[PDB]
Structure formats: structure tokens, C-alpha cells
Amino acid sequence: SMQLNPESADLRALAKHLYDSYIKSFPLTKAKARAILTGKTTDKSPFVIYDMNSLMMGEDKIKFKHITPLQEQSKEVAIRIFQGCQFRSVEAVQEITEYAKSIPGFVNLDLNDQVTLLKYGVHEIIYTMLASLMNKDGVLISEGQGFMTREFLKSLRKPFGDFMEPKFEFAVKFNALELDDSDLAIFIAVIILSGDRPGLLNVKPIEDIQDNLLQALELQLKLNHPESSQLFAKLLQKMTDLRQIVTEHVQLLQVIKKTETDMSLHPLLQEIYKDL
Numbered sequence: 522s523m524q525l526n527p528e529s530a531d532l533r534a535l536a537k538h539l540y541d542s543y544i545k546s547f548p549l550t551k552a553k554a555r556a557i558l559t560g561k562t563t564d565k566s567p568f569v570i571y572d573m574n575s576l577m578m579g580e581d582k583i584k585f586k587h588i589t590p591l592q593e594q595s596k597e598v599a600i601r602i603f604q605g606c607q608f609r610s611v612e613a614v615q616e617i618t619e620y621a622k623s624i625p626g627f628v629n630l631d632l633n634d635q636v637t638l639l640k641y642g643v644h645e646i647i648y649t650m651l652a653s654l655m656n657k658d659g660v661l662i663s664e665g666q667g668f669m670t671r672e673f674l675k676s677l678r679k680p681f682g683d684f685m686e687p688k689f690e691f692a693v694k695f696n697a698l699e700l701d702d703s704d705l706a707i708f709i710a711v712i713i714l715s716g717d718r719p720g721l722l723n724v725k726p727i728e729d730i731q732d733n734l735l736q737a738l739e740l741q742l743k744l745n746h747p748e749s750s751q752l753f754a755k756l757l758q759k760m761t762d763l764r765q766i767v768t769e770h771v772q773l774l775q776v777i778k779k780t781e782t783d784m785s786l787h788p789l790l791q792e793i794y795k796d797l
């Protein structure tokens with residue numbers, strides 16, 4: 522039932538629209554991240570953080586293009602890294618919000634529904650896109666100017682040693698699906714337009730957009746992945762997986778909130794966590 526008809530031409534036009542918007546919204550694509558990770562890039566190598574010495578050298582070398590005040594710098598290494606992650610998460614929320622506004626029909630939704638979809642959506646999208654920046658050894662940071670090792674992150678004192686490991690475990694399995702940016706543009710759109718998010722006023726309009734994104738995604742995967750007939754079904758399970766990874770992350774933050782009372786959680790992230 523794969524046919525070239527006006528319906529399929531419209532679904533290919535939607536896929537290209539989303540790809541083009543995704544390129545504009547997300548500075549470091551998966552294509553450029555893989556080229557850095559394999560060394561295939563002509564770019565200067567990222568600075569590698571693999572121990573305490575290289576962490577402190579990296580803090581001098583990596584132009585984080587972000588102000589960490591004296592009171593934050595005074596914090597121990599684990600809290601500095603965690604506060605860095607929190608800062609990047611807030612930036613990612615901004616990028617994902619600009620991408621969502623490019624999804625046809627999204628800006629026409631009630632502004633409260635746009636905020637709800639983004640509130641419940643953004644962490645699922647952050648873990649999806651973080652996989653693009655990961656291999657089994659570590660994760661690219663600071664728009665690919667740095668690379669932090671998986672074992673260096675595991676070595677941070679409890680509870681900080683556990684926060685990234687679940688994202689690496691998700692990423693190694695997700696990356697084995699070999700999605701490209703063209704696939705991910707549509708996958709992320711599908712997740713954002715989830716009609717079962719709590720406190721949505723107008724469900725039917727979101728479901729109607731999502732159904733069309735799901736058709737565009739299924740057609741993209743069939744064209745772009747002749748090596749697998751399972752990939753669409755496998756991505757539907759990744760969507761359900763992501764909700765449980767976010768649950769787990771929120772529970773970790775609660776432990777951090779209770780047992781590390783000193784520490785400062787970003788007020789914008791606190792708002793999002795309120796009802797996850």
C-alpha cells in the first residue's frame with residue numbers, strides 16, 4: 522500500500538519542513554556530533570574530561586560561554602557539573618520550544634495546551650537528543666567543544682554518580698537503531714504532540730496533528746531504512762520507555778532535593794517537575 526499519491530507527497534513535504542526547522546533550531550545535529558565522535562570532522566578535537574585534573578583544565582579551556590559566579594565556583598566538582606547540566610537543560614527547553622513553533626498547527630493550539638505539551642514533552646526530547654551526543658565512552662558538551670567520559674561521571678560522589686548512567690543506557694540501545702536527523706525531526710514532533718498529557722483542554726486537535734506526524738514518520742522510516750521493517754514499532758516502544766526514564770530522573774532529583782538541601786534547583790525546572 523506504499524503509493525505515490527498526493528497524500529504521500531504531502532507527507533514527504535511535512536518531513537522536509539520538519540527537517541529544515543530542526544536544522545535551524547538545534548545547532549549541533551546528530552550528523553555533526555557523529556563526525557566529531559568518529560574524528561571524521563576537520564574541526565579541532567573536543568577537550569576530553571576523563572579525570573579530576575582534566576575537569577579543572579577543561580573549565581579553563583572550554584569556552585562555556587556562560588557565567589558561573591564565585592558562590593557556584595566555590596561548590597565541589599559534583600555540584601558544578603550538576604549545575605552545568607541544569608543550565609544546559611534550560612537552554613534545551615528554549616531550543617525545543619522554538620522547534621515546536623515550526624510544527625504545522627502547533628501555534629494555532631490554545632497557548633495553555635502549547636505550554637502543557639512542552640512541560641510534559643521537553644525531558645523526553647532532551648534524552649532523545651542527548652543520545653545523538655553520546656557513545657559508549659562519553660558525551661559531547663558545550664556544543665561539541667568538550668567530551669565528558671561515562672566513567673568520570675560514574676565516579677562522582679553519591680547521588681551524583683548515578684544521574685547520567687540511565688541516559689547512557691537509553692542512548693546505547695537507541696543509537697543502535699541508526700536514526701538520522703531526518704528521522705529524529707519527525708520522531709521529536711510526534712512526542713511533543715501527545716494528546717494524553719494531563720490538563721489538556723482540547724485533545725482532538727493535538728491527536729489530529731499527531732496522527733499526520735505518525736503517518737509522515739512511518740513513510741520516512743520505510744524510505745530511509747530498507748534494512749528494517751520493525752523500526753516504526755521499535756520507536757513507538759522508545760516513546761513509552763522515555764516516560765519511565767523521566768519518572769526515574771524526577772525521583773532522583775527528589776533524593777537530591779531532600780538529602781542535599783544546600784543546593785539550588787533552577788526555578789524553571791522546578792515548575793516543570795511540579796507534576797511529573
Ligand SMILES: O=C(O)CSc1nc(Cl)cc(Nc2cccc(OCCc3ccccc3)c2)n1
Nearest residue numbers: 580585589601602605606609661662663664669
Ligand atoms: O554542554 C554544556 O555546557 C551543558 S551539558 C553538560 N553535561 C555535563 Cl555531564 C557537564 C556539563 N557541564 C560542566 C562540565 C564541566 C565542568 C563544569 O563546571 C562548571 C562550568 C564552568 C564554566 C566556566 C568556568 C568554570 C566552570 C560544568 N554540561
